[PDB]
Symmetry: none
Subunit: 310 residues, 6 copies
């Protein structure tokens, strides 16, 4: 089969994603050349950070699609998408690319502080140039919209409250696109796809997704599917693994069973979010010990941390 080609193709695509210069990555994943400069569609962007999704055949390295340069022009983004704030109509310039990749992987922690740095008294404000600095610094651990951030004149102040909102939102749209790049029939994704998602940033544990489908097959949960809401609530649960971690440990030490009920519980009390009953059966299929239903917390929290961190 031509499946030994995919294997070598992803290995390659992956190697780029994690060792090549920002530049090269871009010239690989981005599929649009506009007359003349290259841009990557939201889909491309996301596919550049997800490490296993293949690149469209004849597109690829230094091979893009030629597109001839009002409210009647092409639109790749969508209603609300933070990708419009990027000037174009949902297209991401190489420049926008760096910014965005570094606003995706850095913690609120860092920004909150780095901002407070330029507002010794206020809670955190930055002008057009101050911000340019907060990046050079933050980028050391990894005018499209400049006007969007500081009025049209560039004398506007950027607030940590607004930025966090900006990030907390970029993350939403990115997370949705990942749910989208799986073809959801009626808004639902497979119990297998959902796992593919939860394990993306991990080894070839892609084989334990079979250990899952069996577990579900047995208990008659073999095929409902996971809607985005369900997927998303899990991921807002995941932003707290730290608290969820130390919280799942106490339930352990207190001699309770780390089963579906206590996970749903640690979600309400530690992350103030209601988990779907199915998400838990699926987050268990592939995370309990072996059939146990005993959420192997150590192993869980681990994976989730790199998933949560891309």
């Amino acid at each position: 089969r031509s499946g030994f080609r995919d294997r070598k193709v992803m290995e390659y695509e992956n190697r780029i994603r994690a060792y090549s210069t920002p530049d090269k990555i871009f010239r690989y994943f981005a599929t649009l050349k506009v007359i003349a400069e290259v841009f990557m569609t939201p889909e491309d962007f996301v596919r550049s950070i997800t490490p296993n999704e293949k690149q469209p055949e004849h597109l690829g390295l230094d091979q893009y699609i030629i597109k001839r340069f009002s409210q009647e022009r092409e639109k790749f983004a969508d209603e609300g998408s933070i990708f419009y704030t990027l000037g174009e109509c949902g297209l991401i310039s190489f420049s926008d690319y760096i910014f965005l990749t570094t606003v995706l992987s850095t913690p609120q922690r860092n920004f909150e502080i780095a901002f407070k740095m330029f507002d010794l008294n206020g809670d955190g404000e930055v002008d057009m140039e101050e911000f340019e600095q907060v990046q050079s610094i933050i980028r050391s651990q990894t005018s499209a919209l400049t006007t969007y951030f500081f009025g049209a004149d560039l004398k506007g102040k950027l607030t940590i409250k607004n930025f966090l909102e900006f990030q907390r939102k970029l993350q939403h749209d990115v997370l949705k696109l990942e749910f989208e790049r799986h073809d959801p029939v009626d808004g639902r994704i497979t119990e297998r796809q959902f796992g593919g998602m939860l394990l993306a940033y991990s080894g070839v544990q892609s084989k334990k997704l079979t250990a899952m489908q069996r577990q579900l097959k047995k208990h008659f949960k073999e095929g409902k599917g996971l809607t985005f809401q369900e997927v998303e609530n899990f991921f807002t649960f995941l932003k707290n693994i730290n608290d969820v971690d130390t919280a799942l440990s106490f339930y352990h030490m207190a001699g309770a069973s780390l089963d579906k009920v206590t996970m749903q519980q640690v979600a309400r009390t530690v992350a103030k979010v209601e988990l779907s009953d199915h998400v838990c059966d699926v987050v268990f299929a592939l995370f309990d010990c072996d059939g146990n239903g005993e959420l192997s917390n150590k192993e869980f929290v681990s994976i989730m941390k790199q998933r949560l961190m891309r």
Copy 2:
């Protein structure tokens, strides 16, 4: 060796013996009433959790100082009174007080929410016994003040707020005893004792303590002294080292010199607290590269952490159990 062989020993006990073996060693009183119980004074309590402090050699392991079931032992106010006795700490009070010293706020909050399913966090009496019990299964180690917490009927509840305050004052009362064991003079502490206090939970680091009294003196900055407030404050700035750490890192990179000012500025923005202009002399004295005012932030955040964390291959603990019982 006359003192080091002694200390280096006591320091091993604190660090590896059973809570018990530690309590019998450091505790100084044994109150009689045909039955008797061993009580450690607040003084002993602090000495049992702060290394490099010799116990009265005459007292020591199982050697106490008999009293007659009455006479107060702790300062005027100290949370050590809520303990029922008059400043005394029974083996219970001890195991409890120490576990309420090492576990961070975070953990109690999360632990308390494990009961007030629909609210900030309210734990009744039997739910509390169940929170410590759980919390203790992590601490280095692992009737009088229960009324103080749940009324005299025991039917009241505790709040994660009031308990965090209880813990805040326990940490304060301790900080003051650790400050007292240094013989203040008009409320001042040696530039060397405060230094000592910092390197306290480290090792033979006590040689860089003399490399400090030399540098601190070439600059004529040894003699002004340090008040408990000056000190208490530095320690409130310590409670946020994680944010301090990752705050200095940006300043450093962003270019700025990590000098006496930057520290004080970071202490304000990131830790909402003022750092004594002289406290910084002592900190930089023994934490800056060398002559320069440039502080060695990486090493600073290192020590400061283990200082903030008195105690929290832990086979060595299990090989000890088997090195004596064999």
Copy 3:
């Protein structure tokens, strides 16, 4: 509700009495009759079994009441006075070895003759109605290590049946979980390790066929030679062999001179194999058994090493 928290605190207390109180304090708490206070065979087995809740109404100094109408050799109709307790306990515990040496201490030129006032002294030593049975009606009779061992030996058989009846068997058979729990008895919260047994059993079709009391006593005498059963299983392993249901049988046959039913094996290997193989965990097994059979340092210095090894 907290009906369990209050229960687990009840047990914990009862277990601290049983493990710290004077023989006096003990007997009073469990003894359920009243004159002089006695404890039937049910009371006795319970006063030496941890995690067995005493009928609350009764408990401390609260016993039923009745008028004067091998637990029979004691005197009464199966009821055990207090002296008999302080005796039968010291007997049920101290091993053969000790009595032989205490007896061969008064019969230098034999195996161990012991008259009445010599038995008294033997008891006293060890510790730190039926006597008319042991030494004739004139008390000038003598007791042999042979008869005495036969005494203890039978007592041990009757106190062992007592636990087998303390599970209400259906047609002589007792539950797989009932037998397996009977073992773990003297240990920790390992009571949740049985749930993992019922699983290992349910998989290979063998979850309730039944365990004849005979199978239970044929497995206990097997647990008598542990010290050799251990040194033997260890010679097997080292000899490249495999510690499996086959061999465990062999050993029980040769070294203990007894037969182990394949079933009892499966229940044992169920909750003692290396988490699902067949490879008995000899070291771990012999440990629990020795503590089970009993009712110090470098014992944990080992498990600590293996954890860190991972």
Copy 4:
């Protein structure tokens, strides 16, 4: 020179590979296979005893029906006229240390009916196992001996334990002889050097004994070999001898020369002659301590627990 020489040797004994130990104490070479003689054997495991300096380190003596052992010393069943090959050294050293219990359980694995019979190749596996946990582990004419000349016979624990029992004995006579018995007796002091052969300070607590056996006119009598042996036999029991002494202790009776010979007859079923006891108290006086020494002497500040660990490990 001595205090330094001996130490060196003791070390070899205690830390060198069997090969390097053998080649040291071994003194011969026949034609070329280096053999060691009973003398040499006992001298290898007896600490504080020096080797003929001219010989020693890879230094032997060349030879080419000259007997080297007593009339019926087990060292005859080895094939030679009393010599011990390298193989016979390894075999014997593990038969000396390893306890009966260990040999019985092994033999009993290969014997469902009886108590412990073993064909040739089985004896080889049980010996592979046994030796793979002896301090020494960390062909011979014997096998024609144990299993007929056809190699089809079976060994009994009775018959093996009996062999091992005789070996122990026959080495004791070699130890007790390597002292110089006059008329067949050994100095009060000599039998003391044996009891304390496995401890540091000898001549310290020794001369204190001589002082005490003088104060009580109990010296110069000399100890026979039967006496000395009857003692060590008593020694191969300290485990029960302990739980025995303690019992007499609590029972009220004082632990004296009498209640001891009393324990002897019941725990090891042997008669300790009076003089043997006078000598023991002479330098012991405290059951708790006493046992300890007789422990390290019976066996022969903890880098040994690391070894207990390799063992547990080898058995899990």
Copy 5:
């Protein structure tokens, strides 16, 4: 029900193979007792016997056994005992193996090329390694330490040198000729072997893994690779693949850390690059049914390269403990 009797018999025989003298072994597995005039006789083993005595778990014909043989009366005109051109012919007799040749072959089938190249170099300081007759006798003694073919090696006059290049080839044949005899010893049908019999060869030298074999057929039954059979050639390649377990153990470790899955594919890959051999899809299909993890096509590499090197050699906190159990010694 009585497959038990079958095991004690099976064990007894390995114990003879592992802990007996070469003689007692020869006297047990050997099956021919050739007699001649007037009253002198000798015992020989056929190649089928020789191979059986080294391959554990194969039962010896009940009625034959210890000292029990087939009596043959002394005979290019007489009967042969081995395929056309089986080294066993270079031995002199017609495939028969004398007690002496038994001691030989055993010490040669085992030991590594390395050891032989080094021992030869000792006698040809300037050269690659030549050996006359007496020296070769020495090498054998050196290796072993813890009449018709001698001519075949050193000319008809014993005045001949033997080269490593050559001798090693002899070794190479011996090894190969034995492998065929082991394969053949599983009654092939149309030169192909059962799936179970292949596992048989692979687990041959391991303990009592004989129940995993059953676990295997099941694994195989699900994915319909139930009974296609294995050619000898398919086998011999997996076996020369094994002659590299080292470069393969470290190769699989890297593929592991490098992210990649240890599937039926990467093994093929590993064999290609590392051992310059091509593994057959079916061979891998059997290997995984015997070594996949829970049964998810994930090679348990660790325990695999472990069981295989034992098979490669025909060997008849564990180490993390072994280390310090001596480290405290140094």
Copy 6:
């Protein structure tokens, strides 16, 4: 006093992070970036070498950005880009090239070039390193790319060229280790070469004196070893595996492990000529006791830890040496 200092260092070289280690032994700061002089690099891996008491812990010689040259012409270090200065970045790479076996790179490179011996593009090489680092005790905590993959980075690297880089590096570092002993005329001391051998070895630093006394009574004491003498000895060492078996055979063969045989083993097993003097020193401290006999076992052992630069992450006596200390306290 001087002891308490050294201990610290080793203890840092042993447990500290690849950064704490770097900021300690590196001696420059260019304006701003920290660097280490080849002298520093070597100094950081060789245990017991003292760091200029005025530098160390975060201290450096501030330097200002045919300029200041820091290494004997030709040195590989120059390929690092700068004038011979090793940057932390390149510090790790270099320590992970020195410690690991040639075998590994060979295998590792095969994964990315099925056809040939092995090639590796710029990013594929990033993977090899990454993986290979998981091994080393350095990277188990923690410029030239252009030299490697052309200027455009679109080039390829060979195993050959690379192994050539590794080869040339192991050398230049051995030269620097040599020079950092204060050679006169180009000769180290009988005692300093012995030092070199037992460098990454235990605290056996009280046997050099037993060695100087031995060389003494034999008029060995006082001639010195050249660098070539030492080099060939280390090249000899690049095969202690075959030399271990080679010595072991000569032994059983019956030959004595003397200065003459260890000279013949150097030739046939490594195609290198050992000099009498290097032999005299090796034997001076590695002979059994008195006879010229080599204690080959103990010899190979030590030489191995030395051949490993002590950079081979072995948790063997790890938790042991430490937990042993506990003992010597209770």
